[PDB]
Write a protein that holds these residues in place. Structure first.
Motif, mmCIF file in Angstrom:
data_model
loop_
_atom_site.group_PDB
_atom_site.id
_atom_site.type_symbol
_atom_site.label_atom_id
_atom_site.label_comp_id
_atom_site.label_asym_id
_atom_site.label_seq_id
_atom_site.Cartn_x
_atom_site.Cartn_y
_atom_site.Cartn_z
ATOM 1 N N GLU A 52 0.837 -1.200 0.000
ATOM 2 C CA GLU A 52 0.000 0.000 0.000
ATOM 3 C C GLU A 52 0.871 1.248 0.000
ATOM 4 N N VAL A 53 0.343 2.329 -0.560
ATOM 5 C CA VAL A 53 0.909 3.658 -0.358
ATOM 6 C C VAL A 53 -0.213 4.577 0.093
ATOM 7 N N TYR A 54 0.042 5.365 1.134
ATOM 8 C CA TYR A 54 -0.946 6.351 1.555
ATOM 9 C C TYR A 54 -0.261 7.635 1.996
ATOM 10 N N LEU A 55 -1.043 8.705 2.018
ATOM 11 C CA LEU A 55 -0.575 9.994 2.497
ATOM 12 C C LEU A 55 -0.953 10.168 3.961
ATOM 13 N N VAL A 56 -0.093 10.856 4.699
ATOM 14 C CA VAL A 56 -0.473 11.359 6.012
ATOM 15 C C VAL A 56 -1.308 12.610 5.782
ATOM 16 N N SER A 57 -2.538 12.605 6.297
ATOM 17 C CA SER A 57 -3.546 13.587 5.904
ATOM 18 C C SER A 57 -3.044 15.017 6.060
ATOM 19 N N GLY A 58 -3.025 15.745 4.942
ATOM 20 C CA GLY A 58 -2.700 17.158 4.950
ATOM 21 C C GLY A 58 -1.251 17.478 5.217
ATOM 22 N N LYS A 59 -0.351 16.524 4.989
ATOM 23 C CA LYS A 59 1.073 16.703 5.219
ATOM 24 C C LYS A 59 1.833 16.288 3.967
ATOM 25 N N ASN A 60 3.110 16.676 3.919
ATOM 26 C CA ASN A 60 3.994 16.374 2.799
ATOM 27 C C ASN A 60 4.716 15.048 2.975
ATOM 28 N N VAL A 61 4.083 14.087 3.641
ATOM 29 C CA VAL A 61 4.686 12.797 3.938
ATOM 30 C C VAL A 61 3.743 11.697 3.472
ATOM 31 N N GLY A 62 4.303 10.706 2.777
ATOM 32 C CA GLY A 62 3.595 9.507 2.407
ATOM 33 C C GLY A 62 4.362 8.298 2.918
ATOM 34 N N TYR A 63 3.698 7.152 2.851
ATOM 35 C CA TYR A 63 4.157 5.931 3.493
ATOM 36 C C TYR A 63 3.900 4.771 2.546
ATOM 37 N N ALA A 64 4.955 4.008 2.256
ATOM 38 C CA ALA A 64 4.901 2.891 1.318
ATOM 39 C C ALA A 64 5.215 1.598 2.060
ATOM 40 N N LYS A 65 4.265 0.667 2.050
ATOM 41 C CA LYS A 65 4.415 -0.652 2.648
ATOM 42 C C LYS A 65 4.633 -1.666 1.533
ATOM 43 N N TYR A 66 5.762 -2.373 1.611
ATOM 44 C CA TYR A 66 6.191 -3.368 0.646
ATOM 45 C C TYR A 66 6.296 -4.735 1.312
#
Length: 98
Positions: A52-66
């Motif tokens: 999955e990839v998602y954004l941290v709401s309203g921030k310039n950071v995203g998160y990728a789970k591999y």
């Protein structure tokens, strides 16, 4: 959907099943603003084993789970420091950021 980038990409691969246990994690840091989610999924599935990839709401950071360590390392090697759709990217291991 825009794909404007300064890097050569692998073809899109199928995502790992959503319930797959996470093996590697990436921070994606956007300068100056985050990119749309469909673009992020298209870009980051290309290294294979993307849970999955998602954004941290309203921030310039995203998160990728591999589901695979090598895939996440490939995403780091290919995308860190590159520009995508007018946005500069930092891609790094979540548990040891550079």
């Amino acid at each position: 959907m825009q794909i404007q980038t300064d890097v050569v990409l692998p073809s899109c691969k199928k995502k790992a099943p959503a319930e797959t246990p996470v093996k590697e994690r990436l921070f994606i840091v956007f300068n100056p603003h985050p990119l749309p989610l469909d673009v992020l999924e298209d870009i980051f599935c290309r290294f294979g084993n993307l849970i999955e990839v998602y954004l941290v709401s309203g921030k310039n950071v995203g998160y990728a789970k591999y589901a695979d360590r090598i895939s996440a390392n490939d995403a780091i090697a290919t995308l860190h420091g590159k520009i995508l759709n007018g946005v500069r990217l930092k891609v790094m291991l979540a548990d040891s950021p550079r």
